[PDB]
Each structure stands twice: as structure tokens, then as C-alpha cells.
Design an enzyme around this catalytic site. Sequence first.
Site, PDB file in Angstrom:
ATOM      1  CG  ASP A   1      -1.956  -1.199   1.281  1.00  0.00           C
ATOM      2  OD1 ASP A   1      -2.527  -1.861  -0.228  1.00  0.00           O
ATOM      3  OD2 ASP A   1      -2.997  -0.872   2.423  1.00  0.00           O
TER       4      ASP A   1
ATOM      5  CD  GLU B   1      -2.316  -3.802   3.781  1.00  0.00           C
ATOM      6  OE1 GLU B   1      -1.561  -4.114   2.897  1.00  0.00           O
ATOM      7  OE2 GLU B   1      -3.738  -3.498   3.780  1.00  0.00           O
TER       8      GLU B   1
ATOM      9  CE  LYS C   1      -9.687  -5.079   5.681  1.00  0.00           C
ATOM     10  NZ  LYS C   1     -10.229  -5.918   6.427  1.00  0.00           N
TER      11      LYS C   1
HETATM   12 MG    MG Z   1      -4.400  -2.066   2.457  1.00  0.00          MG
END
Ligand code: MG
Lengths: 225, 225, 225
Positions: C58, C89, C91
Site C-alpha cells: 500500500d 499496509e 486499512k
Molecule cells: Mg490495505
Amino acid sequence: WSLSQLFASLHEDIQLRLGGDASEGVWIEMLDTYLPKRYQAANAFVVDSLGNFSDQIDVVVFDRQYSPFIFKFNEQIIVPAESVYAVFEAKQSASADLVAYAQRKVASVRRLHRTSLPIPHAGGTYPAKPLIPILGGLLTFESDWSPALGMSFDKALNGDLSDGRLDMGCVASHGHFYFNNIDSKFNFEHGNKPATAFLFRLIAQLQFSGTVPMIDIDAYGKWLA
Amino acid sequence: WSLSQLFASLHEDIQLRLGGDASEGVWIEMLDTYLPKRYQAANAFVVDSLGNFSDQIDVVVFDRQYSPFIFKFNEQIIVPAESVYAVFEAKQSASADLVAYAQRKVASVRRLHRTSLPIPHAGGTYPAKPLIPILGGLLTFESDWSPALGMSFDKALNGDLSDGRLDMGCVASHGHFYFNNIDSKFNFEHGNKPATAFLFRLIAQLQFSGTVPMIDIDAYGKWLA
Amino acid sequence: WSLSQLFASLHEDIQLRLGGDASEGVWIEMLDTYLPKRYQAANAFVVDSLGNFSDQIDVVVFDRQYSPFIFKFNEQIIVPAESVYAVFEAKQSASADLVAYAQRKVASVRRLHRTSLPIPHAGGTYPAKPLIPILGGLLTFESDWSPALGMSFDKALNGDLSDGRLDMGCVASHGHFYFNNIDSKFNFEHGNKPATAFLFRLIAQLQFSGTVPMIDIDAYGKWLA
Ligand SMILES: [Mg+2]
Ligand SMILES: [Cl-]
Ligand SMILES: [Cl-]
Ligand SMILES: [Cl-]
Ligand SMILES: [Mg+2]
Ligand SMILES: [Mg+2]
């Protein structure tokens, strides 16, 4: 996905950008796009603190962030010799006359006087840094010779193995060449991605070129009066 | 073509860019255009990890790529002391009061606390890097004195030879000055390209200023709470 | 005026920029805006000279000026492993599955093969430079756990203390974490400026990450054929 496919797609993009008298413009654009950003490329003259000038150089690669000055004069660019990493001559087609001409241009840069000053520090004085080993070369789209990359081209490249030595170069239709210091001879690499193979040869060599020395800026500045 | 003509044409261009209260804007533009790109210039405050601030500095030269942060607050710029290379005060005309004021500003930067951390490595620990030697100076277009660059100006510059010492500066109409560490005295250079001669003095000195140290970023970050 | 207020106003600005599937875009923009300009951030794959690829990362932080190449292929970006400094990463919300996923991504980068060549010089040959110690981490806005930064998160972070180790990360609503090599444990910092505190942790660690090594560019170039 494969690393080979990435290289093939990079070469396709470079061929798009690329595709005698004015052929240097596209090589400038390519190298200023794909060289590491620490480098900058331009059509330029090179000058030294003795007031001597090189010939006009189709493609000069110089230090982007650490050059002390870059003159802009009468629509030309002039760089100090100490911040130059490479110099190339471009023309549509390789020939004996173009190789000799490229050698003379490259010599006109290497014969300039480059300064390098010692470096004080609390304990004492470090020695002056080494000068950048200036790479020279030639960039063409085609060759007048058949075969393009063969004995006749090798003989022409061997016509100047000192101040005018060409370290590397590209014939875009056929391949690239580089001087092999170990065997003291030119190597030709034939292939279907010449300009990209040339780019990777150049980037590999530049990372060992060191950095700009401490320049005698005062000596340049004497020309203010 | 001559190297002298290049310098004359550069000075003509600088004079175009250049030509009290707000005179710093044109010096910022000049220095941010012609300094090596490793440097950046702006009107700014300087801050340290103890939360102390300098006065507002008309022209701060700081590290472009390696500064850890640059605060933007209430339309002002604030730089950490460790990434500063030079600080200048600008005003239309030189006078005793302006020199003293420039000295006080420069002192307010040099009295900040700058950190520098040791550097671990596999074998052991390298000593902390040296702090950047911060250059101070003053930039004006004219002088209240006649002669502009003479005994009265020299006496004013000699009013602070420590934290507020001015290392170099320019009176654009007449010349430039710099402190000569060997003879421990100010040198004046009169000439017809003052701002350009000043620029070349600054670039010559900056190349020996070293690099940003390892900064105690954690110490700055304590102010997050 | 106070240094605390500067940090509060920086955090307000970062929160404006910031405020699962596509949450990485805003973290890229933040880091590419506020990291020192020597670094560059992008959504990218990482590749090595053996033709192996990481997962899609990412947020990759890599060397801006000294990376030898950056592939642009099918609207993706691919960076060589040797010029990577950090990988994150992102999210929307932290969970055990997201931590494990971040660990697997980070491992996929650290398991690539990185080259580093010796450095000739007049006197002899300097040893190869050290590889960059690649930082790994995770960036979320919220947490599925209550408390957000507590025993359950600590247990998840402790699920990979080798190739997949996460060195630092941010839960924007609550705080940040970092691995403490001295005590060999994760530290949580709760506070009202999480993303900014995370940014300062990252900048503090990056300044000790060294520089890009001499890369075996020739080995990459074999994939031209
Ligand atoms: Mg992600
Ligand atoms: Cl050379
Ligand atoms: Cl100082
Ligand atoms: Cl690593
Ligand atoms: Mg030509
Ligand atoms: Mg002023």
C-alpha cells in the site's frame, strides 16, 4: 508478470520518446526522464576556471543539486567542468567521421582544468576529493556500416584511447557498446532493446562515479572583475 | 565568448530580479533561484527542541532535502535550527542601527540549542557530527554612509564579533564584504557586480559547511503532548 | 506562540488530508507531503534482480534521488528492493487478520534478495555498504478492539517477530506503536495527535537508515534479454 516484461515495456516507452543535426533533443529528454534524479541532462558548453570552453556538447550529464552554478547565456547553457559526469555526441547515423568528431568533443571536455580542494576539519585536513571520471560516448539511431556493430566500428572506436576515449554508446537500431577496462577492448552487445540496454550500462557506471569535489569557486569568481 | 561575459550577463539578470520593510522578498527570490538546489531560502523563524524561537529572519538558507520538518503556521515558516546554513537581514539602506539589528537577529539564531546524535554502526558508534557553522549577514541596496564601504561600516561590523558576527553581506550599489578569519578582520570588495560577487562568496563558503547532523527528533516530538 | 501550538496546527492539517480497500491513498499523500524530500512514497510493488516480486504494498517509502530505476507498468509502480526504506499496509480498521496480512506483505519485501557491491578507490577497495534496514508497519483509522491499543493488539503484533515484524504503525483515532529493540517489546503511545506522532517516530528512525548501496545493476540488466 515478469521482470523481463517490465524491461520490454520500458523499452517500448523509450522507443516512443526517441522516435544528425538535431537528434540530440530526444536523447536529452530520454536521459533527463530516466536517469536518477541526482543527475540532470542538457545540451551545454563546459567551462573551467581558466576561462576555457569545451566544444558545444550535445548531451551533458551533470550534478543536479550540487553544481555551484549553471550559466544561461544567449539561449545556451554552460556548466562548470567539475560537476560533469558524462558527455555524448548524437547524430542520426554512425560513421568514421562522426566517431572522430565525438572523440574530439569529448577530449575538449577532458582537457579542461578541474579543481579540487582539500577539506579542513577539527582534527586537521582531509585530502582533496578525486575528480569525477568523465564518461564519453556517442548516440545514433543507425549506422553507415554493414554490419552496424562490427570490425569497422571497432576500428573507429580504437582511434582515440586517451583524452577522446568513448566509454559507451548506442546505435538504436542494433545495440550498444562499452569499453572493457579489464581486457582493454570495446565490447558490442547486439539486441532488441538497445537504448534501454545503453541506459542500464550508463546507470551502472554512474553509481561508481563519486560526487562533485570541493571546487575552487574563488578561482571562478576572479572573472567577475 | 568569455567567462567574464557570462558573469556580466548573470549579474544583469540578477539586477533585474532585484530591482527596508519588505526588501527581503527579492533577495529570497534571487537566492532560491541561484543557490545550488540542495539549499532552499525563505523568510522564516528558527526553532529548537527546547521550544525557543529566533527572531523573524528575513532570509534563512536551510537544507532542502534533509530537513526533518518545516512548520507552516499562520502564514509563517518555521525551520529547525539544525538544518540552517545561513541567516540574513535585509533593508533598503545600511546604517549603524541596521547592522546592530542584523547582529541581534543572527545571535538569536546562534543562541538556539542544536542537537547532534552519535551514529551507531555494526562495529560500534561513530561520534556525533559537527554542527553546521551558521553564516550570518546583511543585504542592502544602498548605504547611509559616504563612502558606502569604509571606516564607519567597518566599525559597525566590528561591534559584534561573537554570537552576532556577520560573516558576509552585500550593498548592492557598491560591493560586498566578508569576514577574513585569517587576519581576523572584515574585507571590502568594491566592484560593478556586487550581488553576484556576494552570491559567489556565499556559494564558496557553503560548500564547506557540511551537512545536517543526526537530530534529536524525539526531543522535538516531546512537544506533541 | 509555542512549539506545542505548531505541532497542534500541523496535526490539524494532517487530519484534514487524512479525513480498508482504498485507504492507502490518503496516507501516501500525507507521507509524500511531509517526509523529508529525500524520500518518496507510492503504492508499489518491489522487485529484485532475481525477478522475484513482493506483494503489492500500500505505501512504499523509497529513495527519491538515488533509486536507479522506477518501473511504470500497466498503471502500477515497481521499485527495486535496494532503494526501499519502509513498507506499510493500510486499512480502515485494525484487526488480527489485518495485522497478519501486514506481516505477510512486509515479509514478502524482506525476503527479496538485495545486492550490495564493494567500492573501488585509488588505494584499494572499500567493503560493500550495509543494506537499508527496512521498516515495516500498519496504518489504520480505527480498531476493531476495545481498548484499541491494548493486550489483544499487542498479541497480534507479537505474532511475527522476524521477516514480517512490524516496527511501527498508527491507529489514527487513538495513537501509535513502535517496536522497542532494547526491551524487545512493543510500546503504545496514546494521545490526541496520533498520525503526527507516528510521522515523527518514522522520521526519527529514517535518519539512521543509511543510504542506497552500490546496486548490482548489471544483474538487473540481464533481464533485458
Ligand atoms: Mg490495505
Ligand atoms: Cl576524466
Ligand atoms: Cl554557528
Ligand atoms: Cl531489512
Ligand atoms: Mg550531434
Ligand atoms: Mg529586514
